[PDB]
Design a protein around this ligand. Structure first.
Ligand SMILES: Cc1ncc(COP(=O)(O)O)c(/C=N/[C@H](Cc2c[nH]c3ccccc23)C(=O)O)c1O
Ligand SMILES: Cc1ncc(COP(=O)(O)O)c(/C=N/[C@H](Cc2c[nH]c3ccccc23)C(=O)O)c1O
Lengths: 390, 388
């Protein structure tokens, strides 16, 4: 269920792009693995993960949370990463690749602002020009992260097309990318876009499941859990979380996508529940489509889940029934965020709370071992959490 | 240079309290150490540091900083800890102690909001009632921490005494403690207050120096740096950073206190520079005083450094010349924060930025190995940073 030699996961994936990018995408294909696997990349990569990011991220037995659901739940604490989310695993990896390929101008899209902060973070470290596209809606709702990016010296470009969300910021980044093939590297923020971006970002996040294996070995005497649970906007934290377990049928995979106001409300981002075959941002995958077959304007309270497409990996997983996918609504997420706060003293990202909310919908046995990926911390969503509390 | 059996660092320290606290403190002294050393404690303590907090925190070689000062500078990244600061090392320890003393009501003071969030955090975790006193000036300067405390289920009590800063929040907590002796445990937020709070908190923070010795051994082939650099409000992140180095004369210690608008200006927190022998919150230490002998109202841009006292360990250390203490002014701290942000992609707390600014004030040789403790991340100070 991992990628094939042509960029495909079953029938989903590939690279579907105008000729203007054919050259630089082709360079990226058939160099990215050479670079990822070189001893130089892997040393500097691993050194920055350890000293800069603070990997490995803990695997934490959440005791009161385990008592509520009548089983053993561990949280993979990506929320403790430098910059507060899993995104930084990806930006560190991609910036090292970008430099190996001689690129000098860095762009990215962001919804939650975690990928934007993680991109401005590594660009300041490296002293490289940073431009971050962000939907206007998102710059309002995730303003703490816009501030961080501006202090880090990045240029934040509000995007005013569509409903001004991730798909739109991505559209703008892609337009930027098209005008600047020579000098610009595009740090895509999820397991989305043209091959090799899905597999690349999956590889860079795989460190998550590499650690889980070792940490479960220490704690449980076996290297596999009964369940992996992760939210999914485009697929990147889930991918990392499942990479080294993707084919291992002892491990059940539960993914939580954003149901918004409910999958039938006309306001949602439940791509698996609602999507049809399309091309989105250079990938042939499942995507929400409106009544004239346009890519649909999605909704979610969560900026990082609010994307109408899904990575081709998860399109495939879902289609094959290797992974079960749940639509989780705004309210369910909000309540699960308040849940982890009072139970474990951890304020989660609204994104990650979609994953937490899924614990209500699964029939656990007492001997079950669950690993849920806490993809980030909720500092960004405090205004929203406190509004909800009133 | 470490505490003696009486709770003194040379002439500083002790417990100078009203008689109403004599017994809680007595109970606290001469159980604290037995609990800290107990296996049950050390096992639960160590498991939460590793799994909940994310220790060991990395020791990060900051190449661009190092270039700019012409030496090797490592940042001890307490900013990466659960809650974003060193305080969680303290609150984890104290809450466990509190539960083993059979206490059920937890109170605390906070200025920067970090110690307040760390307290609210561990009280949420443990299913316990949590009250945090915070100065009114501070509830506004550091409002992102107030929001976190609220959602964690803690009662944030604004204090409007004095100039509504740490000292006043601290007076209010102590008054709560007196008034509720049987049932309440008081999680003090720095190496301050009556014995054994200063030593206890130093010990909980000592985890920092413990990691630095092993991490320097792996990175440099020796267990000790030429310089340790840390900011001090009351002195806990500092104490932690130096605890296992405190008698090692090969290691230079540089402590950065808050100069505010400047030491000779009216408006400062430069206790080592300005303070006089006195008593604050039950500790005999150096403290700022007016011409009367009243406790002088301090000022600093940084809430967590804005304290007219200092821990007894550092009064002793400064007095005996074991530690060099620099007063860093507001603007110096702000520029150093922006410097780290730009050079290493790390936004420090304004507090920790006082330590960063001290890098300007020391002449380093190229063979120097510096460890500076990055006590916190600066999400709380983003409004201040962009005003500037
Ligand atoms: C804390 C946190 N958890 C989970 C997610 C969900 O993303 P995933 O499915 O890739 O694991 C995000 C998204 N972060 C965004 C999301 C994002 C960037 N580019 C995208 C392309 C498609 C879908 C989502 C995105 C950001 O900070 O920007 C996040 O910040
Ligand atoms: C990130 C950060 N770095 C440094 C400091 C300085 O404190 P230290 O000298 O103890 O290492 C603080 C203070 N945080 C406060 C400070 C505080 C609480 N109670 C105190 C009593 C005396 C002096 C300072 C304090 C908080 O969040 O509340 C801090 O939050």
């Amino acid at each position: 269920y991992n990628v094939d030699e042509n960029g495909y996961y079953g029938e989903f994936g590939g690279a579907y792009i105008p000729e203007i990018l054919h050259k630089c995408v082709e360079d990226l294909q058939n160099n990215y693995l050479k670079i990822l696997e070189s001893p130089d990349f892997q040393k500097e990569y691993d050194q920055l993960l350890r000293d800069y990011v603070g990997r490995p991220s803990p695997l934490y037995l959440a005791k009161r949370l385990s008592e509520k659901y009548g089983c053993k739940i561990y949280l993979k604490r990506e929320d403790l990463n430098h910059t507060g989310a899993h995104a930084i695993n990806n930006t560190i990896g991609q910036i090292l690749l970008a430099r190996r390929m001689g690129k000098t101008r860095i762009i990215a899209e962001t919804g939650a602002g975690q990928h934007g902060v993680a991109t401005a973070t590594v660009c300041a470290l490296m002293n490289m020009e940073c431009i971050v596209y962000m939907g206007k809606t998102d710059v309002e709702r995730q303003h703490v992260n816009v501030q961080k990016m501006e202090m880090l010296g990045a240029t934040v470009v509000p995007v005013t097309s569509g409903n001004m969300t991730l798909k739109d910021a991505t559209n703008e980044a892609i337009r930027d990318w098209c005008c600047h093939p020579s000098d610009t590297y595009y740090i895509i923020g999820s397991t989305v876009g043209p091959h090799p971006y899905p597999d690349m970002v999956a590889r860079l996040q795989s460190v998550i499941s590499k650690e889980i294996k070792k940490q479960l070995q220490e704690k449980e005497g076996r290297d596999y859990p009964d369940y992996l649970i992760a939210c999914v906007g485009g697929g990147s934290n889930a991918a990392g979380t499942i990479y080294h377990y993707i084919d291992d049928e002892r491990v059940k995979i539960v993914l939580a996508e954003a149901g918004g106001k409910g999958i039938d409300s006309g306001m949602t981002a439940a791509t698996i529940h609602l999507g049809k075959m399309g091309i989105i941002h250079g990938s042939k995958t499942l995507v929400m489509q409106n009544e004239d077959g346009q890519i649909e304007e999605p909704y979610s309270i969560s900026a990082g889940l609010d994307y109408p497409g899904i990575g081709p990996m998860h399109a495939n997983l879902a289609k094959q029934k290797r992974a079960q996918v749940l639509a989780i609504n705004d309210d369910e997420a909000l309540n699960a965020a308040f849940e982890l706060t009072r139970l474990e003293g951890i304020i989660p990202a609204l994104e990650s709370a979609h994953a937490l909310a899924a614990l209500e919908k699964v029939k656990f046995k007492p001997e079950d071992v669950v690993v849920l990926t806490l993809s980030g911390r909720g500092d960004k969503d405090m205004e929203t959490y406190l509004k909800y509390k009133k």
